[PDB]
Design a binder for this molecule. Structure first.
Ligand SMILES: *[C@@H]1O[C@H](CO[C@@H]2O[C@@H](C)[C@@H](O)[C@@H](O)[C@@H]2O)[C@@H](O[C@@H]2O[C@H](CO)[C@@H](O[C@@H]3O[C@H](CO)[C@@H](O)[C@H](O)[C@@H]3O)[C@H](O)[C@H]2NC(C)=O)[C@H](O)[C@H]1NC(C)=O
Ligand SMILES: *[C@@H]1O[C@H](CO[C@@H]2O[C@@H](C)[C@@H](O)[C@@H](O)[C@@H]2O)[C@@H](O[C@@H]2O[C@H](CO)[C@@H](O[C@@H]3O[C@H](CO)[C@@H](O)[C@H](O)[C@@H]3O)[C@H](O)[C@H]2NC(C)=O)[C@H](O)[C@H]1NC(C)=O
Ligand SMILES: *[C@@H]1O[C@H](CO[C@@H]2O[C@@H](C)[C@@H](O)[C@@H](O)[C@@H]2O)[C@@H](O[C@@H]2O[C@H](CO)[C@@H](O[C@@H]3O[C@H](CO)[C@@H](O)[C@H](O)[C@@H]3O)[C@H](O)[C@H]2NC(C)=O)[C@H](O)[C@H]1NC(C)=O
Ligand SMILES: *[C@@H]1O[C@H](CO)[C@@H](O[C@@H]2O[C@H](CO)[C@@H](O[C@@H]3O[C@H](CO)[C@@H](O)[C@H](O)[C@@H]3O)[C@H](O)[C@H]2NC(C)=O)[C@H](O)[C@H]1NC(C)=O
Ligand SMILES: *[C@@H]1O[C@H](CO)[C@@H](O[C@@H]2O[C@H](CO)[C@@H](O[C@@H]3O[C@H](CO)[C@@H](O)[C@H](O)[C@@H]3O)[C@H](O)[C@H]2NC(C)=O)[C@H](O)[C@H]1NC(C)=O
Ligand SMILES: *[C@@H]1O[C@H](CO)[C@@H](O[C@@H]2O[C@H](CO)[C@@H](O[C@@H]3O[C@H](CO)[C@@H](O)[C@H](O)[C@@H]3O)[C@H](O)[C@H]2NC(C)=O)[C@H](O)[C@H]1NC(C)=O
Ligand SMILES: *[C@@H]1O[C@H](CO)[C@@H](O[C@@H]2O[C@H](CO)[C@@H](O)[C@H](O)[C@H]2NC(C)=O)[C@H](O)[C@H]1NC(C)=O
Ligand SMILES: *[C@@H]1O[C@H](CO)[C@@H](O[C@@H]2O[C@H](CO)[C@@H](O)[C@H](O)[C@H]2NC(C)=O)[C@H](O)[C@H]1NC(C)=O
Ligand SMILES: *[C@@H]1O[C@H](CO)[C@@H](O[C@@H]2O[C@H](CO)[C@@H](O)[C@H](O)[C@H]2NC(C)=O)[C@H](O)[C@H]1NC(C)=O
Ligand SMILES: *[C@@H]1O[C@H](CO)[C@@H](O[C@@H]2O[C@H](CO)[C@@H](O)[C@H](O)[C@H]2NC(C)=O)[C@H](O)[C@H]1NC(C)=O
Ligand SMILES: *[C@@H]1O[C@H](CO)[C@@H](O[C@@H]2O[C@H](CO)[C@@H](O)[C@H](O)[C@H]2NC(C)=O)[C@H](O)[C@H]1NC(C)=O
Ligand SMILES: *[C@@H]1O[C@H](CO)[C@@H](O[C@@H]2O[C@H](CO)[C@@H](O)[C@H](O)[C@H]2NC(C)=O)[C@H](O)[C@H]1NC(C)=O
Ligand SMILES: *[C@@H]1O[C@H](CO)[C@@H](O)[C@H](O)[C@H]1NC(C)=O
Ligand SMILES: *[C@@H]1O[C@H](CO)[C@@H](O)[C@H](O)[C@H]1NC(C)=O
Ligand SMILES: *[C@@H]1O[C@H](CO)[C@@H](O)[C@H](O)[C@H]1NC(C)=O
Lengths: 486, 486, 486
C-alpha cells in the first residue's frame, strides 16, 4: 500500500462544495485565547493606576509619579478617579487623542509676569499634603487686595517645534463668590494667535454637590507653531498656564483595560491581554496596538495540510507530497488588502445643563419675555436637533464598520475553502496518477483492492520494494508463480 | 454508449472562464414572481383600510374598529386619510416605529383630576355620529366660565412595565380665539419625569384652509419606566391624556402596500405580495417581513445539476452520478454572512412655515429691528444648513446601501459560477475516468467513436451488458470474430 | 517532442496557491502610463485659459471669447484668476455643478424696467477697455439723483424650458459709502417664485485690500420652471440680472488640470491626460470623463495566456491550444457590477469673518450687553459645531470610498489569480492527456525522457510525424530494430 497510515482523530475543514469533510492533520488559523496579562517588553507600557491621561497632564496630587514620564502605550484603568477641583473639558476626546499620539509629558516651565494679581489660588478639595492646594501646571490668579486689572500677556515661539498651551476658566456658584474672587461682576477670556481666537465668558450657576463644591472649571487648549505669537487677554475667571509641553509625532496611543502586567515578551497588546502573532487572524477583540493578526468574526478557520482519512486499516510503504509552504502565500493576498480602523474620534459633546438666559424683566415680563423664552427654546430645539444628527452619524458609522467586517470574514472563509478544495484535489490527483504509473510498472503481479492500494498475490523481499520505489521493475521473477495461479 | 440521453431544450449557466455553456437540466435560484396577494395565515395581518397607525392610535371616529387590536404586522394603504382635527407630529417617524414594534393597541384608562377646567372640547371637523366631537384617547380642556388655573398633575408608575403617555398643544389662528378658549394671552406646556422635561409654547399664526380650520394641534409623547413619576404643568393650549398604552417588545413592524388579502399560508410578506421561501435569493423587493430569501440585483442565477449537452443522437446504457445535495451546503456560506438592512429611521423634519418673531417696533423699527431681522435670518440660515446636512447624510446613507448590494450580488454570481465550473469538471472527470476503466476492461472488442461512446464491432445479449456493468468481463467469446475482422 | 519551444524571458503571474510562477507569454491588464496631453477629438474640449467656469458665466472682461460657447467638457487651469470686482458665492460648489452639467452658455437677454434708478454702475478694478466698467450679464443699479425707490419687478415663464436667473447683493466698507450709493442706511433683497423666497440684508464691514477695494459682492441664483413667475423686491444694494441662461441636461461636466491639448483621437480624459481604453482597469487617477477602464490600486495585474516555461532546451513538433477569447468573458463579470463614484458635492461653506452684532449700548453696556455677547458666542459655538459635524461627514465619506476601492481591488486580484490557476490547470491537463494518448498510439517505439517529451530510439521521415499527427500509426516498420535492441 501507500495508504497514508490512517491518522487517528483528524478533524473537519470547510470546502466550497462538500462541508465537514475530514483530513489527516489540520492547522488552526484564528488565535482565539488570551493569558489575561500585558508583557513589560519590548514596548514601554505605563500603568495609570488611579489616574487618567488628562489627570496626569494637569498634575493630580496623587499622580506626581508621572512627571516627565515616557510611554510607548498608555493604559487607563476603570478604578481611576479625580481627587482635586471638579473640572470640565469641551471636546474632551480631541485633546486626549493629541496627548496620546505624542508619547511624552515633558513640561517646560516659562516666565509669565502676572502684575496686579495674587498667584497660587488654594482649594480644600485638592489639599496638597496637609494644607490647601491645586493642580501643578496651572496658576489660579485672584484679585490682589481690591483690584483685578486686564491681564494682557504675549509669548513669541522662536524655536523649531510646536508648543501646547493648556488654560481654563472658572464657573462660580453665586455672583457674591464671583465678586469675592474677581472685583468685576462678569469675566471674559480671549486667547489669540496670528491664525485663531477663542473668547469665552463665565456661566454663573448652581450645580450638584461634588466633594463639597458647586463651582466648576472648563479646560481649553491652543497650539502655537514655530514663528507665531500668543496673546492672552482677560478681566476675571482665568486659570493661567505656567509653561508648554514638548510635542512630537510617531507611533504612540492609549487603550482602556483591567489586565495585570507580567515579565514576558509580546508586541501585540489588546484589552483582553497579550496575543502571540503566529496566526494570520484573531477573534479576541478589534482594537490592536503593535503588530497583530487582522480581526474576523468566526471561532475556527481550519486550513488543511494533507489527505482525507480514507481507510479501514493501515499498511506500510512510500508516500507522496505534503502541503508545505502554501500558507504564507495566500496569507499575502488578504493581509495586503485589509485596512486599519477609522478611529471613533468626535464621540459627542454630552452636555447636561439648562443654558438659558437669566433676568425676570427680560425672560418672564412682557413681549420681551416671550421673545427671550422663544430664543432659549429655539436654541434647545437646535441642541436636540444637533444631538439627533450626531447620533444618526455615529449610528451610520457603526453600520459601515459592521458591514466591512462581515464582508472581509466572508472573503476569508471563501479563501480558506478554495485552498482546501484545491489542496484536496492536488494531493488526490498526485496519488491517483502515481498509483496507476505504479500499475503500468507492475506488469500484472498485483491488483488494487479498491482503496488506492495493491493486493500483492506473491511475496518479495525489500529489494522488490526498492525496485518499485525507483520505478526500475521486471516481472520475470514471478512468471512461474503467476502462470500456475492463472 | 453512456451518452447522457441528449435531453432536449436544456439551458445556459455562467462559468468563470466560458460563458453561456449549456447543461442537461438546470435549476433557477431567484424567485422573481408574485401572485399580488397577502395570505391571512400563519401571521396575524391587520388591514388599516382607511387609517394609518397614528390615526388608529389617536382614535379616529371611522377607525373605532381597531380598539384593543392585536397585529403581528401592520399594513398601511395609500387611500387612507384623516377625517378629524388637522394635526402635526414633530419627529413623526420615531413615534410610529415605537408603536409599530410593540404589536398592540391595549389602552388602559387612568384617573386624572382636572380642577377649574371644562372637559370634552368639541370640533365640527371631527363630528362623532351626528353632533360635534374629537379623538377618543385625548381630553381637550378649555376655560371653566372665565378662569383657567395652572394644571399641575402627577402620576407615579408603581407596576412592572413602562407606560406610553400621548399628549399635545393647540396652535390658534388669532389671539382673539386664543383668549376665547384660554383667558391667558399665551400658553406653556411642561412635561417632566425624574430624567427629562419638554417645555413648548403655542405659535399663533394663520395656515391654509383644511376641512374649514386654520388652527393646528402638535402631538408629543413621553415614556415613563417602572419606579418613575410624571408631572404635567400648563397654563393653556393643552391636549391632556386619559390613560397609557401597555408596551411590549418582540417581532412586530409595519409595511406600506396596495395588495389584496387571501386565504393561503405564507410567512414571507413583501409590498408586491406573498413569496414562497424555497429559493435562496429573491429579486422582488428589498423590504421583507418574516423569513425570506436575501435580495440580489439580477433576474436569473442558474445553478447547474448535471452534464453539458454533447451529442448528435442518443444510445442506451448505464450512467454515473447527479449533483444531488450540493445546493444547501453552498447556500450555507452566503446565507450565514449576509446582513439585515439598516432601517431609514430619522427621515427628515420636513417643516414648511415662516417661524420668525412678531412685533412692528421689535422687528421693523430702529437698530432693534435690524438685530431681530438679523436673528430670524440667522435661524433661517441655520435651518437651511441643517436641511443641507441631513440631506447629505441621507444621500450618503443611500450610497452605502447601494454599494453593499452590488458587492453581495457580485459575490453571489461568482459563487454560482465557481460551483457550476467545479460541477462540470467533477462530472466530466468521473465520466472520462469510468469510460477508460471500461476501455481497459474491453480487451479490444469495441473502440470509442470520439463522443465518449464505444462503437461495438460485434453483437452480444444483455448478459454482456451486465458483465460490463459489474466490471467482470473476458474477451474469449469474441476471439474468432475479432481474428477474422483483423 | 511537443515541448512548447522554451520562449525566452517570459514573466510572473499570481496564482491562488503558488506565487510568482512563470508563463510563456503574458498580458498586462492595467494601462498605467500617460502621454500628458488631451486630444481635441472626438469630444468638444474647451480650454478656460485664464478663467474659471463662474468667471465665464458672469462675463469677465478678459473672457468675452467664451460668449455663447458650447462644451462637451470644461477644463479649469490653476493659473486662472479674476480681474474684476472681488466677489463671493455662498454654496459655490452647487451653482458650478449646475452650470457644468448643462454644457452651454447661451445667454438670452430680457426686457427689465428699472424706474427711478441709474443703470450701468462702474468700477476701476473692472476697467472694460480704457475706462471704468463691470461684468457683462449684470446691472449695478444706484440712486438716480437723490432717491432710490423699492424696485418691484415681475416676469412670467410662458415657454417650454426652465430659466436660470443670476443676481447678487453689495456689501459696503462704511455706512457713508452705503448712503452715497443708496439713500437708505440699510438694504434688503427679496427674490420669490410660487415655491420659494430668499431675503438677504447687507453686512457693512471692512475687509482686506484686494486690487484696491475693501467692499464685496455676494452672488445668488434662482431656478424658474415653465408656468411660474418671479418677483424681485429691493430697497438698495442690488445687482440686477439682464436675462436668463437656457438650461439643458445630458452628459456634460468639468475637470481641473494643467495638461496641454493635441490633435489625436481619444474618448477617455483624465487630469494626467488621454488614456487608450483597450485595458479593463487603469491606475492613473480616479476621476474619468467619457468611457474609461475602472480604477484599481495596484501597478500590474498579469493575466496569463499559455504554458509554464518547463525546459532545459527546445525540440520541434506539433502543440495544443492557446487561451484565446477568455479575457472578455471574465471582463464581463467585474465590469458589470463595479459602480460610478459618489460625487463630492457639498464640500464646505468655508466662511472666514467675524459676523457678530454691532452697537456699543447693545453689546458692551449693561445686562443687554451680556445677553447680546452671549448670543453671538452661542452662534460662534453653533458655527464651530457645524464645521466639526460637516468635517466628520466628509471624513466618513472618504473612509467609505477608500474601503470600496480596496475591496474591489482585492476581488480583481482574486479573479485574475483564479483564471490563471484554471488556465494553467486546463493547458497542463490537455497536454498530459494528449501525450499519453500518443503513448498508447506509440506501441513501444519511443519513451518519455521525463519532461513531457518522447525520446525516440529509431529515426523516421516526416511520413511518421504526419501518421502521429493524425493518430493513424502501426509499429510493424520498426519491429526488426526494436527486437534487435531488446
Ligand atoms: C522634568 O523635566 C524638566 C525639563 O527637562 C526635561 O525633562 C528632563 C527629565 C530631561 O529629559 C530634559 O532634557 C528635558 O528638557 C527638568 O528640568 C531640567 O532641570 C535642570 C535643573 O534645573 C535644568 O538644568 C538647568 O539648565 C539651565 C539652562 O541651561 C541652566 O541655566 C541651569 O543653571 C541648569 O543647569 C534642565 O535644563 C531642565 N531641562 C530643560 C528645561 O532643559 C526637571 O528636572 C524634570 N524633573 C521633574 C519636574 O521631575
Ligand atoms: C379594551 O381594553 C380594555 C382594557 O382591557 C384590556 O383589553 C382587553 C380586551 C383585555 O385584553 C384585558 O385583559 C386588557 O387589560 C377593556 O377594559 C376592561 O374592561 C372590563 C370591564 O370594565 C374590566 O373589568 C373590570 O375590572 C376592574 C378591576 O378588577 C373591576 O373593578 C371592575 O368591576 C371590572 O370587573 C377589565 O378589567 C378591563 N381590563 C383591564 C383594565 O384590566 C375594554 O373592555 C376593552 N374594549 C374596548 C374599549 O373595546
Ligand atoms: C449670442 O447668443 C445670442 C442669442 O442667440 C443664441 O445664440 C446664438 C449663437 C444662436 O445659437 C441662437 O439660436 C441662440 O438663440 C445671439 O442673439 C441673436 O441675435 C440675433 C441678432 O440680433 C437675433 O436675431 C433677431 O431675432 C429677433 C426675434 O425674431 C428679431 O426680432 C430681430 O429682428 C433679429 O432677427 C437672434 O434671434 C438672437 N438669438 C435669439 C435670441 O434667438 C447673439 O448674436 C450671440 N452672440 C454673441 C453675444 O456673441
Ligand atoms: C475582552 O474584554 C472586552 C472588554 O470587557 C470584552 O468586551 C465585551 O464583550 C461583550 C460581548 O458580549 C459585550 O457585551 C455586549 O455588548 C454589546 C455592544 O457591543 C451590547 O449591545 C450588549 O448589551 C452587551 O453589553 C461588552 O459590551 C464588551 N465590553 C466592552 C466593549 O467594554 C470582550 O468580550 C473580552 N473578550 C474576551 C475574549 O474575553
Ligand atoms: C413592487 O411594488 C413597489 C412599490 O410600488 C415597486 O417599487 C417601484 O419600483 C420602480 C422601479 O422602476 C420605482 O421607479 C423608479 O424609482 C426610482 C427610485 O428608486 C426613481 O429614481 C425613478 O424615477 C422611478 O420612480 C418606483 O419608485 C418604486 N416605487 C416605490 C418604491 O414605491 C416595485 O417595482 C414592485 N415590484 C414588482 C416586481 O412589481
Ligand atoms: C495625476 O495628476 C494628479 C494631480 O496633480 C496627481 O495627483 C496627486 O497625487 C499625489 C500622490 O502622491 C498626491 O500627493 C499626496 O496626496 C495625499 C492625499 O491624497 C496627501 O495626504 C499627501 O500629503 C500628498 O499630498 C497629490 O495630492 C495629488 N494631487 C492632486 C489630487 O491634485 C497624480 O499623482 C498624477 N498621476 C500621475 C500618474 O502622474
Ligand atoms: C500536524 O501539523 C502540525 C503543523 O503545525 C505539525 O506541527 C509541527 O510539529 C513539529 C514537531 O513534530 C514542530 O517542529 C513544528 O514546528 C510544528 N509546526 C509546523 C510548522 O510544522 C505536527 O507535527 C503535524 N503532526 C503530524 C502527525 O504530522
Ligand atoms: C495688549 O497686548 C497686545 C499684544 O501684546 C498689545 O499690542 C501691541 O502693542 C505694542 C505697543 O503699542 C505694539 O508695538 C505691538 O505692535 C502690538 N502688537 C499687536 C500684535 O497688536 C496691546 O498694546 C496691549 N494692549 C494693552 C491695552 O495693553
Ligand atoms: C430537472 O431538475 C429538477 C430539479 O427541481 C427536477 O425536479 C424534480 O421533479 C420531481 C418529479 O419528476 C419532483 O419529485 C422533485 O421534487 C423535483 N425537485 C427536485 C428537488 O428534484 C426535474 O425532475 C429534473 N428533470 C429531469 C428531466 O431530470
Ligand atoms: C406642582 O407639582 C409638584 C409635583 O406634584 C409639586 O411638588 C410637590 O409638592 C409637595 C407638597 O409641597 C411635596 O410634598 C413634594 O415633594 C413635591 N414633589 C416634587 C417632585 O417636587 C408642587 O408643589 C406643585 N406646585 C403647585 C404650585 O401646586
Ligand atoms: C504574446 O501575446 C500577445 C498578446 O497581445 C501577442 O500580441 C499580438 O501580436 C500580434 C502580432 O504578432 C498582433 O497582430 C496582435 O494584435 C497582438 N495582440 C493579440 C490580441 O494577440 C504576441 O504576439 C504574443 N507573442 C508570442 C511570442 O506569442
Ligand atoms: C409688488 O409686486 C407684486 C407682484 O408683481 C404686486 O402684486 C400684484 O399686484 C397686482 C395689482 O394689484 C395684482 O393684480 C396681482 O395679483 C398681484 N400679484 C401678486 C403675485 O401678488 C404688488 O402689487 C407690488 N407691490 C407694489 C407696492 O408695487
Ligand atoms: C480518539 O478518538 C476515539 C474515537 O473513538 C476516542 O474514543 C478516543 O477517546 C480519542 N482520543 C483518546 C483520548 O483516546
Ligand atoms: C424545443 O426546442 C426546439 C428547438 O428547435 C423547438 O423547435 C421546440 O419548439 C422546443 N419546444 C417545443 C415547444 O416543441
Ligand atoms: C533575456 O534574458 C536574459 C537572461 O539571462 C538576459 O541576459 C537578456 O539580456 C534578456 N534580453 C536581452 C536584452 O538580451
Amino acid at each position: 500500500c501507500l495508504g497514508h497510515h490512517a491518522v487517528p482523530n483528524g478533524t473537519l475543514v470547510k470546502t466550497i462544495t462538500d462541508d465537514q469533510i475530514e483530513v489527516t492533520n489540520a492547522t488552526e488559523l484564528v488565535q482565539s485565547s488570551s493569558t489575561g496579562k500585558i508583557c513589560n517588553n519590548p514596548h514601554r507600557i505605563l500603568d495609570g493606576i488611579d489616574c487618567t491621561l488628562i489627570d496626569a497632564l494637569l498634575g493630580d496630587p496623587h499622580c506626581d509619579v508621572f512627571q516627565n514620564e515616557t510611554w510607548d502605550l498608555f493604559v487607563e484603568r476603570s478604578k481611576a478617579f479625580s481627587n482635586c477641583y471638579p473640572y470640565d473639558v469641551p471636546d474632551y476626546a480631541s485633546l486626549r487623542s493629541l496627548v496620546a499620539s505624542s508619547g511624552t509629558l515633558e513640561f517646560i516651565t516659562e516666565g509669565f509676569t502676572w502684575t496686579g494679581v495674587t498667584q497660587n489660588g488654594g482649594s480644600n478639595a485638592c489639599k496638597r499634603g496637609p494644607g490647601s492646594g491645586f493642580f501643578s501646571r496651572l496658576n489660579w490668579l485672584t484679585k490682589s487686595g481690591s483690584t483685578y486689572p486686564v491681564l494682557n500677556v504675549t509669548m513669541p515661539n522662536n524655536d523649531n517645534f510646536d508648543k501646547l498651551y493648556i488654560w481654563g476658566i472658572h464657573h462660580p456658584s453665586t455672583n457674591q463668590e464671583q465678586t469675592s474672587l474677581y472685583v468685576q461682576a462678569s469675566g471674559r477670556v480671549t486667547v489669540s494667535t496670528r491664525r485663531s481666537q477663542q473668547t469665552i465668558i463665565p456661566n454663573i450657576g448652581s450645580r450638584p454637590w461634588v466633594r463639597g463644591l458647586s463651582s466648576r472649571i472648563s479646560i481649553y487648549w491652543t497650539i502655537v507653531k514655530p514663528g507665531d505669537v500668543l496673546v492672552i487677554n482677560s478681566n476675571g475667571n482665568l486659570i493661567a498656564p505656567r509653561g508648554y509641553f514638548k510635542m512630537r509625532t510617531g507611533k504612540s496611543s492609549i487603550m482602556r483595560s483591567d489586565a495585570p502586567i507580567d515579565t514576558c515578551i509580546s508586541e501585540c497588546i489588546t484589552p483582553n491581554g497579550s496575543i502571540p502573532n503566529d496566526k494570520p487572524f484573531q477573534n479576541v477583540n478589534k482594537i490592536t496596538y503593535g503588530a497583530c493578526p487582522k480581526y474576523v468574526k468566526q471561532n475556527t478557520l481550519k486550513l488543511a495540510t494533507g489527505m482525507r482519512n480514507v481507510p479501514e486499516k493501515q499498511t506500510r510503504g512510500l508516500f507522496g507530497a505534503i502541503a508545505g509552504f502554501i500558507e504564507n502565500g495566500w496569507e499575502g493576498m488578504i493581509d495586503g488588502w485589509y485596512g486599519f480602523r477609522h478611529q471613533n474620534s468626535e464621540g459627542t459633546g454630552q452636555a447636561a445643563d439648562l443654558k438659558s438666559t437669566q433676568a425676570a424683566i427680560d425672560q418672564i415680563n412682557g413681549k420681551l419675555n416671550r421673545v427671550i423664552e422663544k430664543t432659549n427654546e429655539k436654541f434647545h430645539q437646535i441642541e436636540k436637533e444637533f444631538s439627533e444628527v450626531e447620533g444618526r452619524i455615529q449610528d451610520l458609522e457603526k453600520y459601515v464598520e459592521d458591514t466591512k467586517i462581515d464582508l472581509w470574514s466572508y472573503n476569508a472563509e471563501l479563501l480558506v475553502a478554495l485552498e482546501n478544495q484545491h489542496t484536496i484535489d492536488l494531493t488526490d490527483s498526485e496519488m491517483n496518477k502515481l498509483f496507476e504509473k505504479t500499475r503500468r510498472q507492475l506488469r500484472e503481479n498485483a491488483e488494487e483492492m479498491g482503496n488506492g492500494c495493491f493486493k500483492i498475490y506473491h511475496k518479495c523481499d525489500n529489494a522488490c520494494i526498492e525496485s518499485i520505489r525507483n520505478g526500475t521493475y521486471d516481472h520475470d521473477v514471478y512468471r512461474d508463480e503467476a502462470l500456475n495461479n492463472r
